[PDB]
């Protein structure tokens, strides 16, 4: 089959632009025994791609995950029709020998979109699950501050927090995202771009401070939040998207005198640390919570593979309510 | 009784200067029942005073600890002659009701200087004890990076690490301090002020990276050290002295992408968290290790109460080998 592929023509400077991407067509080689041919059904764009793209050489395929269907098979375990998760990058077709492939949960129902395996019941949901439950170690009754709270990770973080008996304070980048999270049952939601004083807004959202901080943004926003952590407060360091598209130098680090006096524990993590029984258990919990109504989901489906860079840039700018997904 | 007292005349701007301090004489009231009159024998000056002094109002007494002798007693538990640790600030005499007082270890011998209870077998030694053994959680075989390594805290950290079976790499601020730490048994010691590249020196000191980082300095030094932490490395955040006397804005924070990829655990602490049985047990371990020779000690005794500001400023600027102590 003929395949389409998005490649990094020029390393990003600040935010990506259309000129930074280049579409290339290629013919795929024939299948050898044991291999399968995968047709992409849904591809994801995620903030981490902005950082990962710096490690690429110009001309390389952009990295990313997809839900795909086996359309040609010489592997009996993966017959035609099998749905899998694969990470060949931003490409419409690929060949795999089956080792780097994951099948969906065997209990996956036909009533939830297949693309949820890239969002709330996929990598972002697992990031929220372990970052909140093990790094922050929330145990109930605490107050959690989560930013980028309408994103793929943040929205799952807040909903798990509510389901564990927590107060949740969410910061988002648009008025539409404020309304969306209020429907979900977030205690406080505010638009960090428009508030008069971020420090006063956080103080009013939790005058006694915050037990936990699920941090996706970093930068100066996290310096202000660190000034309102309770003593022995815990910060889960997940991402720093406010810094990824920076053109200048990094902002000042968190004020060390506040950090010491409050004796904060700040641990970073990557979702891929958890595997095996622990990972399967978390995925099942995510699916159960979705079907019970305890976790709601929202998607922003963009049609057309060659619109993928536009989907990535819009996601980077906070312009899309719900998980940005490209339908092939 | 008459007392002398050093007070903060003007909040420090950068490093302190002489005009920021003011000496005042006053007469103390008579003792009420249950109270004692304490005469200072040894007073300590410590880096934390630079930060703590910012919370004072002008005219307040400078904070600090001292070894003192009861010269008048209406308190049955604390008769005349009793030696105690007390924290009335930079004063030659004070009155206490006994509740904020600490008694010496009953196993404290007369063969070691009394002033050691303010240094290696006092608060700085306890800071090293808990920061290294519980925050970093060293278990033997690890490689520890310690800065301000010839100071009261840093020097104890390295020596405890050696007796626990660890490699220690110490950074100090003077050539005289380099010889001192090699005599104590540090694996690598270097003068961070004079090396051509801090990054290259740390790499040659430990090509495998560092399991633990006992951080007293903060700032850019810690950004470089963070770039050489092993995966899941632990940082004990004790102080940031490179920042206490800062006049401009804070330097850039550690690169969040390195922090996340390495999944570092960075926890701050204050020595006063540990009290009761735990504190006395650690003190007994410090005294025992001192008496066994496993922990060596050095003091820089400055005579005269009226020299306390000069002793404090010299300590802040790195001009003193060993624990700075003022003999009244």
DSSP-assigned states of every residue in B60-82: PBPP--EEEEEEEE--SSS-TT-
- Matching residue, tokens 């935010």: A15
Residue A286 lies in a domain: no
Residue B278 lies in a domain: no
CATH number at residue A144: 3.40.50.720
Residue B171 lies in a domain: yes
The answer to whether residues B113 and B216 belong to one domain is no
Q: How many CB atoms lie within 10 A of CB A194?
A: 11
Spatial CA neighbour of B162 closest among B134, B145, B140, B147: B140
Q: How many CB atoms lie within 10 A of CB A142?
A: 20
CA distance to A60, A92, A299, B27, per residue, from A8 (Å)? 6, 16, 26, 78
The answer to whether residues B54 and B29 belong to one domain is yes
Domain of A226 in residue numbering reads as 123-271
Which of B243, B257, B261, B273 should one mutate to test binding to chain A, selecting the residue with the greatest count of A CBs within 10 A? B257
The answer to whether residues A21 and A142 belong to one domain is no
CA A318 to CA B25: how far, in whole Å?
64
A318 is known to lie in a ligand binding site: no
Nearest to A252 among B253, B257, B261 (CB): B253
Spatial CA neighbour of B153 closest among B175, B135, B179: B135
The answer to whether residues A70 and A133 belong to one domain is no
CA B285 to CA B279: how far, in whole Å?
10
The answer to whether residues A95 and A177 belong to one domain is no
Domain boundary, last residue among A228, A255, A271: A271
How many domains is chain A built from? 2
The answer to whether residues B127 and B265 belong to one domain is yes
Note whether B252 contacts A253, CB cutoff 8 Å. Answer: yes
Residue A208 lies in a domain: yes
Expt. technique: X-ray
Nearest to A260 among B250, B262, B270 (CB): B270
CATH number at residue A314: 3.90.180.10
The answer to whether residues B151 and B233 belong to one domain is yes
CA B271 to CA B275: how far, in whole Å?
9
Note whether B252 contacts A257, CB cutoff 8 Å. Answer: no
Whether the CB of A248 is below 8 Å from some CB of chain B: the reply is: no
Whether the CB of A251 is below 8 Å from some CB of chain B: the reply is: yes
Task: Please tell me chain A's helix, strand, coil percentages from 3-state DSSP, rounded to the nearest 5.
Answer: 35, 25, 40
The answer to whether residues B247 and B321 belong to one domain is no
Q: How far away is chain B from the Cα of A257, in angstroms, using its nearest Cα?
A: 8
A270 is known to lie in a ligand binding site: yes
CB B155 within 8 A of CB B181: yes
Residue A196 lies in a domain: yes
The answer to whether residues B252 and B319 belong to one domain is no
Residue A317 lies in a domain: yes
Q: How far away is chain B from the Cα of A239, in angstroms, using its nearest Cα?
A: 7
The answer to whether residues A114 and A191 belong to one domain is no
Residue A284 lies in a domain: no
Q: Which residue of A has its CA nearest to B249?
A: A252
CA distance to A77, B18, B38, B86, per residue, from B2 (Å)? 92, 24, 12, 18
Q: Which long-range contacts (CB under 8 A, 24 or more apart) does A274-279 make?
A: A274/A126, A274/A130, A279/A126
Domain boundary, last residue among B271, B288, B309: B271
The answer to whether residues A113 and A163 belong to one domain is no
Residue A264 lies in a domain: yes
CA B35 to CA A244: how far, in whole Å?
61
The answer to whether residues B252 and B137 belong to one domain is yes
């Amino acid at each position: 089959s003929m395949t389409k592929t998005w490649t990094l023509k020029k390393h990003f400077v600040g935010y990506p632009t259309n000129s930074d991407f280049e579409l290339k067509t290629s013919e795929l080689p024939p299948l050898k025994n044991g291999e399968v041919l995968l047709e992409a059904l849904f591809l994801t764009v995620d903030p981490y791609m902005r950082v990962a793209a710096k490690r690429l050489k110009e001309g390389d395929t952009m990295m990313g995950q997809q839900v795909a269907k086996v359309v040609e098979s010489k592997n009996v375990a993966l017959p035609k029709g099998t749905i899998v998760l694969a990470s060949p990058g931003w490409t419409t077709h690929s060949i795999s020998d089956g080792k780097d492939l994951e099948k969906l949960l065997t209990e996956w129902p036909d009533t939830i979109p297949l693309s949820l395996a890239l969002g709330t019941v996929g990598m972002p949901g697992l990031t929220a699950y372990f970052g909140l439950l093990e790094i922050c170690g929330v145990k109930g009754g605490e107050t959690v501050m989560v930013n980028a709270a309408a994103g793929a990770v943040g929205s799952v973080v807040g909903q798990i927090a509510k389901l564990k008996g927590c107060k949740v304070v969410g910061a988002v980048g648009s008025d539409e995202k404020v309304a969306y999270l209020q429907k979900l049952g977030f205690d406080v939601v505010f638009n960090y771009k428009t508030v008069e004083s971020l420090e006063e807004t956080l103080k009013k959202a939790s005058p006694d401070g915050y037990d936990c901080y699920f941090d996706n943004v970093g930068g100066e926003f996290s310096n202000t939040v660190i000034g309102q952590m309770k003593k022995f407060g815990r910060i889960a360091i997940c991402g720093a998207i406010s810094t990824y598209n920076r053109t200048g130098p990094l902002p000042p680090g968190p004020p060390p005198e506040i950090v010491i006096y409050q004796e904060l524990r700040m641990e970073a993590f990557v979702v891929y640390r958890w595997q095996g029984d622990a990972r399967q258990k978390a995925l099942k919990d995510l699916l159960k919570w979705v079907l019970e109504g305890k976790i709601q989901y929202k998607e922003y489906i963009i049609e057309g593979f060659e619109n993928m860079p536009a989907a990535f840039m819009g996601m980077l700018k906070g312009d899309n309510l719900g998980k940005t997904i490209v339908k092939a």
